[PDB]
Design a binder for this molecule. Structure first.
Ligand SMILES: Cc1cc(C)c(Nc2ccnc(Nc3ccc(C#N)cc3)n2)c(C)c1
Lengths: 552, 427
């Protein structure tokens, strides 16, 4: 029940001292249960009767179940943990099954009991002190102290997981085949022996552990494969997500919308193609909760498709370090991009999605990259290497861009996969003014107060125009003036703006943006043959822009 | 090894607790590397394995040192530093010789090996702790902490001074004109004698060190030269300004004069004495763009007036050692990048340009990394302290590869800026 394990020295935060909380009620019956518990506990050495020598008490209690036959002591160390040093965290991040190597047979051993087997640093027992009242009042009650690891102390998961890891070591060496992984109260073992031998070894594992006071059972309660873990369904040869449920409701509220979206991303790791742009576009309102939201048209259509998807079970395969890691990405449409990672052409290893939520003006090629990148980061964590990519873009395209783009990128190994859709530049602005082309001296201001303004142009050829605009911003007109020149210009045009805003946007070479304004513009740019944009200092400067702002 | 000393007390800045930084995921190879390295360090007795009672943590990486065959461990002590050495740039500050930059040539030699002998104050160790990750985080990371002055941590050098200036004094004697500056793990030695003599005074020094114990694991080459005649040798007296100039042209078009009026108007934030009006007034019309046009009254007087004030360095620009250094870097294209190191907008302290060879062998990233590490050293050599880079790269990307071509012993401070429009043009 307790081991000759060396203890981890602990301490209490810098200036702090032991918890001196108390509580002294007395349900005669409970006090018996606890005193009944305490004995079997001190008798087993897990605690020990201590007497007034400054002990710092803590709350005691008793709880009971429905399929009960017993009771349960449940101390509350809340005010103890708030005084203990910090420990090496345990769950940096959870391993992802998409990167788990296949095995023959597995096995999990219940090791919850365990932490009452691992020793507590002598000098820190004096704090685990609690007192259970007797009946009425000549004795404060019976007084104990913890000798192993309290059930709710801060540094217990820690000090356990550590201790365990050291104990496994001999076993782990004398058996490199066997993979051991411990989670919370579980200790999963996985190897390549046929069940028979597997269990030989397992029992050895058990015996080993047993010599160290950490006991375990051979036929307690729960079930085996599938193994329900972290919301995963694990099998000795495949793995899949927790069966999910897309609730059907007559009225949906933020809370339900969230919990709805949440499940969908989670199903995304293996289910191919799940979209989510529409359903979240809604939640874009950040502070309601019981504020019912009208599932719009789009969201609706979307949800359904994920149903069509989900209706079908999909499972994933494991990682063979013997083969390559291939990554293929396809654009779904409105900033939506999907991908599946495999070594084998049929069953996948993992899948996911990437939607440029960031900002509101990005190009199709840039996005392909943000994606390739999102995945590279992913693989490194899961498999420790970069996959080989298969993507819908042709070198000419790509190389062109990374050469034109002001930021540095680094696209690794990649093969072209000719399959619609296709990433490509729909247009390119000219780098030199076009000789002959009419020159439009564009401009357009707006009233920050009245939201009224105008957008015009005045050409070299003497041609003018001024359109009045209601309910807009300067950026909006500074963009409508350009869209104006484009509509009235010919196939080859020269445009001058005193707006770095409109300038840069157009320049980014946006495949799209829902800003219907920029769209009409982007589309004109597509309908043109040759376009040249030109910037110029707004006020101190040219007279053409001013000539349109005196107008404005 | 034998206990060559009796440690020195290191206390973090008050109100400061050790570092708890996250370990970046690593490549399967890089792990094996560290794993190997660390097992030796452990036998040698440099580092020790730690328990759960050590909550702290600092980042680590595996890089290729000067391209050799074996990997080198590079710990990212950037946080422990802020927290310690800032108040150790005080108690034990190492002074920066304002003339090293004037020297004819500067060679740099890795003396990091030195520290691996001076035992570290035991009550400080916990802080140096680092953790080697496991792929797919399946296995609990391995955890170690330093028992000796670790490289990378700016307090290691600051404690070694005593021990260093001793090893050197009987060489700085018979070589009173070469200046030796020690910045962390490197030694910058500068002289004004034909490279042939320098390169010797160097090997002259390199051995002094080696005979007094310090190994200078820098056996660069011999006399069997596959084109790699490289040894770190900088030339600071040639570190001159690159006044970007306006273009001189016979035929000036509307378009052209336009951009020109632009660059100038942007220029005026660094030089307020610039004017355009008369040149610009030659644009007030709404003429075509391809059209060539004529000078004006003092337009030519201005293209020359400014062209002057713009070829002279701006005053009021001084080096505040109370502030930090900010280096901005912009991609110019075709292996060419430009940079600005300052402390306040437009008051540039120094500006250069970098450039790598033609296509088929280099990508941007590798370049940036290089441009960076380059700029940094310049800075160390001129001001004795590394700057903070405003990098024009996607964060994540950078994070993924910056180590792939990172050859330096130290790591600067950086961040990422998606923005520069005119700047590219102006420079
Ligand atoms: C929970 C769980 C159990 C184990 C043994 C591991 N570790 C490893 C290490 C290497 N390969 C595998 N494959 C594997 C794990 C569980 C199952 C099942 N069922 C099948 C294969 N698991 C992890 C990360 C989680």
């Amino acid at each position: 029940p307790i081991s000759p394990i060396e203890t981890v020295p602990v301490k209490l935060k810098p200036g702090m001292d032991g918890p001196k909380v108390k509580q002294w009620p007395l349900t005669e019956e409970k006090i018996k249960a606890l005193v009944e518990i305490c004995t079997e506990m001190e008798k087993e050495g897990k605690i020990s009767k201590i007497g007034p020598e400054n002990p710092y008490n803590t709350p005691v209690f008793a709880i009971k179940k429905k399929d009960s036959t017993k009771w349960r002591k449940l101390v509350d160390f809340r005010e103890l943990n708030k005084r203990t040093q910090d420990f090496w965290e345990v769950q940096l991040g959870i391993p992802h099954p998409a990167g788990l190597k296949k095995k023959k047979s597995v096995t999990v051993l219940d090791v919850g009991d365990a932490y009452f087997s691992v020793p507590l640093d002598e000098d820190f027992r004096k704090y685990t002190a609690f007192t259970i009242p007797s009946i009425n009042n000549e004795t404060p009650g019976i007084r104990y102290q913890y000798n192993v690891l309290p059930q709710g102390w801060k540094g217990s998961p820690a000090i356990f997981q550590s201790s365990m890891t050291k104990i496994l070591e001999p076993f782990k060496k004398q058996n490199p085949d066997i993979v051991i992984y411990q989670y919370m109260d579980d200790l999963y073992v996985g190897s390549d022996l046929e069940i028979g031998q597997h269990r030989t070894k397992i029992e050895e594992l058990r015996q080993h552990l047993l010599r160290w006071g950490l006991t375990t059972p051979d036929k307690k309660h729960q079930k085996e494969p599938p193994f329900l873990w972290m919301g995963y369904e694990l099998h000795p040869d495949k793995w899949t997500v927790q069966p999910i449920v897309l609730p059907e409701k007559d009225s949906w509220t933020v809370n339900d919308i969230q919990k709805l979206v949440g499940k969908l991303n989670w199903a995304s790791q293996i289910y191919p193609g799940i979209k989510v742009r529409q359903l979240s576009k809604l939640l874009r309102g950040t502070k309601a909760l019981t504020e019912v939201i009208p599932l719009t048209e789009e969201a609706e259509l979307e949800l359904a498709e994920n149903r069509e998807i989900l209706k079908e079970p999909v499972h994933g395969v494991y990682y063979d370090p013997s083969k390559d890691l291939i990554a293929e990405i396809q654009k779904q449409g409105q900033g939506q991009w999907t991908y599946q990672i495999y070594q084998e052409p049929f069953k996948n290893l993992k899948t996911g999605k990437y939607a440029r939520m960031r900002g509101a003006h990005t190009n199709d090629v840039k996005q392909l990259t943000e994606a390739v990148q999102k995945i590279t980061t992913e693989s490194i964590v899961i498999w420790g290497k970069t996959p080989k990519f298969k993507l819908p873009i042709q070198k000419e395209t790509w190389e062109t861009w990374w050469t034109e783009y002001w930021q540095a990128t680094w696209i690794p190994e990649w093969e072209f996969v000719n399959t619609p859709p296709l990433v490509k530049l729909w247009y390119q602005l000219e780098k030199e003014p076009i000789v002959g082309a009419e020159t439009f001296y564009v401009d357009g201001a707006a009233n920050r107060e009245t939201k009224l303004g105008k957008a015009g142009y005045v050409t070299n050829k003497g041609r003018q125009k001024v359109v009045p605009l209601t309910n807009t911003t300067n950026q909006k007109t500074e963009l409508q003036a350009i869209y104006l020149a484009l509509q009235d210009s010919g196939l080859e045009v020269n445009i001058v703006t005193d707006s770095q805003y409109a300038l840069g946007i157009i320049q980014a070479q946006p495949d799209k943006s829902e800003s219907e304004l920029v769209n009409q513009i982007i589309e004109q740019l597509i309908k043109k043959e040759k376009v040249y944009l030109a910037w110029v200092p707004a006020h101190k400067g040219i007279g053409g822009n001013e000539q349109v702002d005196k107008l404005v | 090894p034998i206990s060559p000393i009796e440690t020195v007390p290191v206390k973090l800045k008050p109100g400061m607790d050790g570092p708890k930084v996250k370990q970046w995921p690593l490549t399967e190879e890089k792990i094996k590397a560290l794993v190997e390295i660390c097992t030796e360090m452990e036998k040698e007795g440099k580092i020790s394995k730690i328990g759960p009672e050590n909550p702290y943590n600092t980042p680590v990486f595996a890089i290729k040192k000067k391209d050799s065959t074996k990997w080198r461990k590079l710990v990212d002590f950037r946080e422990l530093n802020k927290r310690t050495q800032d108040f150790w740039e005080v108690q034990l500050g190492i002074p920066h010789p304002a003339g090293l930059k004037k020297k004819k040539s500067v060679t740099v030699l890795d003396v990091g090996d030195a520290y691996f002998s001076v035992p570290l104050d035991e009550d400080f160790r916990k802080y140096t702790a680092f953790t080697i990750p496991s792929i797919n985080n399946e296995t609990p990371g391995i955890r170690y902490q330093y028992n000796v002055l670790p490289q990378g941590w700016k307090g290691s050098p600051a404690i070694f001074q005593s021990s260093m200036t001793k090893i050197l004094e009987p060489f700085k004697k018979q070589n009173p004109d070469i200046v030796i500056y020690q910045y962390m793990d490197d030694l910058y030695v500068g002289s004004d004698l034909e490279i042939g003599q320098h390169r010797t005074k160097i090997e002259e020094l390199r051995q002094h060190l080696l005979r007094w114990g310090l190994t200078t694991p820098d056996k660069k080459h011999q006399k069997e030269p596959p084109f790699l005649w490289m040894g770190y040798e900088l030339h600071p007296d040639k570190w001159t300004v690159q006044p970007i100039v306006l273009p001189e042209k016979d035929s000036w078009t509307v378009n052209d004069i336009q951009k020109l009026v632009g660059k100038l108007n942007w220029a005026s934030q660094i030089y307020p004495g610039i004017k355009v009006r008369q040149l610009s007034k030659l644009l007030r019309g709404t003429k075509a763009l391809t059209e060539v046009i004529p000078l004006t009254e003092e337009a030519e007087l201005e293209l020359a007036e400014n062209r002057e004030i713009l070829k002279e360095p701006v005053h009021g620009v001084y080096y505040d050692p109370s502030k930090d250094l900010i280096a901005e870097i912009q991609k110019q294209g075709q292996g060419q990048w430009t940079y600005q190191i300052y402390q306040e907008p437009f008051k540039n302290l120094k500006t250069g340009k970098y450039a790598r060879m033609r296509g088929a062998h280099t990508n941007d990233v590798k370049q940036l990394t290089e441009a960076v590490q380059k700029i940094t050293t310049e800075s160390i050599v001129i001001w004795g302290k590394t700057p903070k880079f405003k990098l024009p790269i996607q964060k994540e990307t950078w994070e993924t590869w910056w180590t792939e071509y990172w050859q330096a012993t130290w790591i600067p401070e950086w961040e990422f800026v998606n923005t520069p429009p005119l700047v590219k043009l102006w420079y």
